[PDB]
From Swiss-Prot:
Activity at various pH: Optimum pH is 7.3.
Binding site for substrate: L32, F104, S117, N132
Keyword Transmembrane helix: no
Gene3D superfamilies, alphabetized: 1.10.530.40
Effect of S117F: 10-fold decrease in enzymatic activity
Induction: Expressed late in the viral replication.
Effect of substituting N132I: 5-fold decrease in enzymatic activity
UniProt similarity note: Belongs to the glycosyl hydrolase 24 family.
Name recorded for this polypeptide: Endolysin
Length: 161
């Protein structure tokens, strides 16, 4: 297991535009295109991201290229965020994957609400952090995925995957 295999499990792979769990146009391995309800706006974002007129459809190689970019940008964003970087750097490699996964799903904006969880993670109070992480819209809206990510934060193992 590694971050790519983990997010591939959690996000799936679809080669045509689909709506994500929040109703937003997406493609590939969880590549969010736009929050606009206009499918044409989503198709334009797709064409811009791929560099050709895709008509709403991409190849597996193209999906994997977006995924590489999206994972890279997620972790680099963690490092550029002064609140997240010290917590991330305090973690072991497996728990770092849980952090990348959560940021990939929620963005750094959705992560702004996790201040108290972040402190418990940096303190290595793992069971307490896991309880706190689950007191969230995130957990309630995607409980099976959040349970996997939380178990990864709690244990530092890949047991949930
Ligand atoms: C809130 C997700 C997270 C956890 C640890 C470090 C960075 C980001």
């Amino acid at each position: 297991m590694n971050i790519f295999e983990m997010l591939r499990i959690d996000e799936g792979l679809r080669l045509k535009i689909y709506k994500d769990t929040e109703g937003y146009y997406t493609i590939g391995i969880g590549h969010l295109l736009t929050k606009s309800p206009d499918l044409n706006a989503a198709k334009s974002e797709l064409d811009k991201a791929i560099g050709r007129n895709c008509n709403g459809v991409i190849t597996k190689d193209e999906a994997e290229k977006l995924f590489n970019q999206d994972v890279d940008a997620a972790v680099r964003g963690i490092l550029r965020n002064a609140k997240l970087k010290p917590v991330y750097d305090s973690l072991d490699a497996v728990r770092r994957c849980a952090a990348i996964n959560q940021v990939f799903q929620m963005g750094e904006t959705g992560v702004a609400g996790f201040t108290n969880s972040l402190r418990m993670l940096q303190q290595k109070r793992w069971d307490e952090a896991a309880v706190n992480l689950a007191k969230s819209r995130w957990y309630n809206q995607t409980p099976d995925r959040a349970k996997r990510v939380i178990t990864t934060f709690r244990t530092g193992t890949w047991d949930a995957y």
